[PDB]
């Protein structure tokens, strides 16, 4: 019904956060802010109408089905989860989190096939590791026999490193042992600003 994006923004105070919502439905749309350990706060309603006590820095807009919340001169108070809302429906939320500006770092990519131990219990987990990259924006696609996957993968990211200010990320393709036996080529395609070209790490089943 209401699809919000991106999932996470990584910014510093002074920068601009652009959050979006896609809706096919008719209905006044509103934006809420939620700071850590506090009740959500109405920020925009009726698409672009600033709520009381809300600075000009906060600005809503609409282009066809796409609504946008723009926060201009970011301040520590502004960080948290933002949600769009239309009648009784909400977006998944966009997390805008404090980030430390650093030189671009390309991820080194590693893929790990299912351990034999596991396959002996009817489930196959393929794992892709993107290590020590920056900025956080990164894209990981799974391909099985070259076909795009959907739904059967989960991701997980570490916080910014206190030492090198890099992010690390894991993607895990969970398949039944059945499906795992049907296909030969497993691969994760990674894209990131620090990569001249998209990188692919792959392997053939039963063939290290």
């Amino acid at each position: 019904v209401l699809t919000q994006s991106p999932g996470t923004l990584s910014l510093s105070p002074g920068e601009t956060a652009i959050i979006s919502c896609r809706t096919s439905q008719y209905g006044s749309l509103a934006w809420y802010q939620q700071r850590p350990g506090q009740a959500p706060r109405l920020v925009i309603y009726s698409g672009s109408t600033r709520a009381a006590g809300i600075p000009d820095r906060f600005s809503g807009s609409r282009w066809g089905p796409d609504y946008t919340l723009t926060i201009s001169n970011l301040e520590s108070g502004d960080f948290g989860v933002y949600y769009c809302q239309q009648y009784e429906f909400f977006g998944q939320g966009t997390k805008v989190q404090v980030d430390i500006k650093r030189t671009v770092a390309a991820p080194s990519v590693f893929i790990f096939p299912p351990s034999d131990e596991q396959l002996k219990s009817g489930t196959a987990s393929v794992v892709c590791l993107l290590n020590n990259f920056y900025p956080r924006e990164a894209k990981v696609q799974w391909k099985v026999d070259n076909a795009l996957q959907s739904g059967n993968s989960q991701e997980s990211v570490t916080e910014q490193d206190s030492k090198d200010s890099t992010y690390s990320l894991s993607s895990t393709l969970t398949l039944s042992k059945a499906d795992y036996e049907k296909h030969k080529v497993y691969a994760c395609e990674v894209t990131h600003q620090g990569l001249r070209s998209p990188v692919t790490k792959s392997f053939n089943r039963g063939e290290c």
Partner: protein, 224 residues
């Protein structure tokens, strides 16, 4: 000054039912619609229903019809929410909200502090720990990656150190993730000199205290 005040947080167990309250101040109680919203980290906020204190009319979110009940004490300007047959998936912070003006319900300018409810299970389950082994080809020029897949445990959390604390530099332990199974999954990796693989033992130490479980998995390469 429209102010909504909610009851204190609660701890519950699967099967139990909960009742929270919400007292409205600074306006005509019967003249404005009321709402119950719950928020849980990582979950889409969920509207549970609205209550019109006038005659106590209601409208429950379809996925909740049967389980939820919303009432009110018109002499005490207090709204009540009851949710029964609690599962772990009912863990959230519950809020009551009102519109900015009575002519429109959905622009929630007013929220209570929110009542946090935690639903804890007596059930536990230790993780299966699978090696994520370096293979490919020395992994790279000189850097190798390896880890453990700590799968299907519950509830949270799990500890994972390497060689019992000896190895910390280069270690990344990822946020646990919930699966459709209802069980959690977690990965932990480390980078190391690809040359040392043949001579350096790597062990990961997984502790799931809820099931008092200790697993030490040696992750060795792929000597084909």
């Amino acid at each position: 000054q429209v102010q909504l005040v909610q009851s204190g947080g609660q701890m519950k167990k699967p099967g139990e039912s909960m009742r929270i309250s919400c007292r409205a101040s600074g306006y005509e109680f019967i003249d404005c619609t009321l709402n119950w919203i719950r928020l849980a980290p990582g979950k889409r906020p969920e509207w549970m229903g609205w209550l019109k204190p006038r005659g106590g009319a209601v409208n429950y979110a379809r996925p909740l019809q049967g389980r939820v009940t919303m009432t009110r004490d018109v002499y005490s300007d207090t709204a009540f929410l009851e949710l029964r047959s609690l599962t772990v998936d009912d863990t959230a912070v519950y809020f009551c909200t009102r519109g900015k003006n009575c002519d429109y319900n959905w622009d929630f300018e007013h929220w209570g502090r929110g009542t946090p409810v935690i639903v804890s299970s007596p059930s536990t389950k230790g993780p299966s720990v699978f090696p994520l082994a370096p293979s490919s080809k020395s992994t790279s020029g000189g850097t190798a990656a390896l880890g453990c897949l700590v799968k299907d445990y519950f509830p949270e959390p799990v500890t994972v150190s390497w060689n019992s604390g000896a190895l910390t530099s280069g270690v990344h332990t990822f946020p646990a993730v919930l699966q459709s199974s209802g069980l959690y999954s977690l990965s932990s990796v480390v980078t190391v000199p690809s040359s040392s693989l043949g001579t350096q033992t790597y062990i990961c130490n997984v502790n799931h205290k809820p099931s008092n479980t200790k697993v030490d998995k040696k992750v060795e390469p792929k000597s084909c």
